Amino acid sequence: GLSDGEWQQVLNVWGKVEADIAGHGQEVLIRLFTGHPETLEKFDKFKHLKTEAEMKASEDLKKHGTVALTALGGILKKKGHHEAELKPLAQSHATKHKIPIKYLEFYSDAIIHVLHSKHPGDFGADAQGAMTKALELFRNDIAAKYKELGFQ
Ligand code: HEM
């Protein structure tokens, strides 16, 4: 788990996302898709996009970015007591969307990158530590459900 101090830092950083959830959610998926084009292939409805500019221009991409980061935000605000929130995501991502856990690692990395890129000099070493631990906690708990489902 995380200490109370660490959860405080996590949710303080999340304040930055909450002020522009769609812009942050869009940049996260653009960073995913451009750094790891295999990820793009899991979305039939984005799979049409060839270029980053079409990605930037895509209002449905922004919308999905909003859906995804809102769901992460809700999970983070449970400070690890997130069993009921994780279950359906584990199930849909492992069994319907067929998303290898490695791609959730790429996604977590993309969140860190995007925070530094939008807030350079304002995402301090303590905050990156705490945010990385929360994301790892999420991945570990999801990984347990994937194992249960035989996906990984
Ligand atoms: C923190 C990580 C993530 C969160 C919180 C998240 C959340 C969500 C949510 C709330 C939905 C809609 C509800 C559902 O289908 O369960 C969704 C749909 C989906 N997610 Fe994720 N997701 C995450 C990571 C990923 C990653 C890494 C990928 C692929 C590389 C992915 C692929 C998808 C796909 C394909 C859909 C279906 C999209 C559609 O409507 O056509 N997700 N995600």
Ligand SMILES: O=N[O-]
């Ligand atoms: O909760 N103090 O690390």
Ligand SMILES: [S]
């Ligand atoms: S997603």
